[PDB]
From a paper:
[name] responds to host-derived antimicrobials by inducing the expression of the mtrCDE-encoded multidrug efflux pump, which expels microbicides, such as bile salts, fatty acids, and multiple extrinsically administered drugs, from the cell. The mtrCDE genes are organized in a three-gene operon, and their expression is repressed by the divergently transcribed transcription regulator [name], which is a dimeric TetR family member with a predicted N-terminal helix-turn-helix (HTH) DNA binding motif and a C-terminal dimerization/inducer-binding domain. Under physiological conditions, [name] binds to a 27-bp direct repeat located upstream of the mtrC transcription start site in the intergenic region between the mtrC and [name] genes and represses mtrCDE transcription, as well as that of its own gene. As in other bacterial multidrug-binding regulators, [name] likely responds to the influx of multiple cytotoxins into the cytoplasm by dissociating from the mtrC promoter and relieving repression of mtrCDE gene expression.
The native structure was refined to 2.0-Å resolution with final Rwork and Rfree values of 20.4% and 24.7%, respectively. The asymmetric unit contains two [name] dimers, with nearly all 210 residues of each protomer observed, with the exception of residues 1 through 7 in two subunits or 1 through 8 in the other subunits. The subunits of each dimer are composed of nine α helices. [name] has two distinguishable functional domains: an N-terminal DNA binding domain with a helix-turn-helix (HTH) motif and a C-terminal dimerization/ligand-binding domain. The dimer interface is formed primarily by the burial of hydrophobic residues in the middle of a four-helix bundle that is formed by α8 and α9 of each subunit. As observed in all other TetR family members, the multidrug-binding pocket of [name] is located in the C-terminal domain with ligand-binding residues contributed from all C-terminal helices except α9. The initial solvent-flattened electron density map revealed positive electron density in each of the four independent putative ligand-binding pockets of each [name] protomer, suggesting a “ligand” was fortuitously captured during the purification or crystallization process. The density could be fit by CAPS, the biological buffer component of the [name] crystallization reagent. Thus, our final structural model of [name] does not contain CAPS. Despite our inability to refine this mystery electron density with CAPS, its location provided insight into the chemical makeup of the putative [name] binding pocket. This cavity is primarily composed of nonpolar residues and is populated with more than 20 hydrophobic or aromatic amino acid residues.
Author numbering:
A (entry chain A): 8 to 72, 83 to 209
B (entry chain B): 9 to 75, 82 to 210
Write the structure that this text describes.
Amino acid sequence: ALKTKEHLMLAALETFYRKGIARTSLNEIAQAAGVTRGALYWHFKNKEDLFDALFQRICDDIENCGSWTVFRHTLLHFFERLQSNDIHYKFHNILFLKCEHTEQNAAVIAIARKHQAIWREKITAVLTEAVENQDLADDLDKETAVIFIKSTLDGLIWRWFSSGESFDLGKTAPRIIGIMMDNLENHPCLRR
Amino acid sequence: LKTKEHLMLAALETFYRKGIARTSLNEIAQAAGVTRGALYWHFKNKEDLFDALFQRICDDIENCIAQGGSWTVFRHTLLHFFERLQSNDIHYKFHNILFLKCEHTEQNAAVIAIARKHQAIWREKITAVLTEAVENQDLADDLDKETAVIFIKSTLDGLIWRWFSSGESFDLGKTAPRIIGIMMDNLENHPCLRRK
């Protein structure tokens, strides 16, 4: 039963990746899945639900893989998987490059915003554990730190996709991550 | 030419409302209050209007950099970029369009090609700032210039993306100077940005 839901969302992933989210229709997804519109509707009422499910599959894969070191490993595995996992590659390609913030995509954008809030809470908890464990300074500005972490990671992703993958992500990401973590631990501009 | 600028801002406003892919030349002409023939005389297609907007953005930046040491000027230029991103409607709308309303589809392939040309321009300009800073001994002689440019663009693009994509939910005036100061400290001191 989970295989029928998976076939439809992967057909959605393929159509989104080719046409973008705004121009993708339910009929195209159903056609690409080789199913009827009614069969698609049985599992997913709309593009929002397909995109949201894609978000959950990405987050499930990440979570199914001390605390400050695990975070570092998680960031490194994330960028490796962007190069080796076709679903993670295409999903983030869609999110950053094929998902325009227009009124037409408002409900898809609302789903994306819900997942940004979730990443925010997960990073904030990582920082909290690192502070109590003395991996980070007691006067760390956690709010600025979260913005800093997300901006660093988003910049590398956006830059990699928008450049047409014109630089080696396997060599670049550990260096970007290493500088980021050094800044979080030591740079005074990230303190209250 | 004031007739050309009227057309470019009609394109900017329509791009900002509808996105680049869904905008048609007729809508731009209509919004500018001119005929399709009048528009085509100055701009053959959406790409060239987008290209002209890119140039106005670059002209604005260069006519302000024209106002000690080039490395300190670079700091000011970066700070001024994010300030006008928040205070100048043309710079706000254009970069909003670029990051959030310009999807990388086959339909937009020609627009994307224009953007790629201007990324190459920014890359060359950042490389020249880096070359000057090394020659002025503001940056180490063994700076990895290739990684540093990628590093600079990634830091700045990430902040812009984050600000727009979050719905401007944090204070850019207070956040960008911290980000810039850290970025420039890393370029000056961090060993990961060295060739060795």
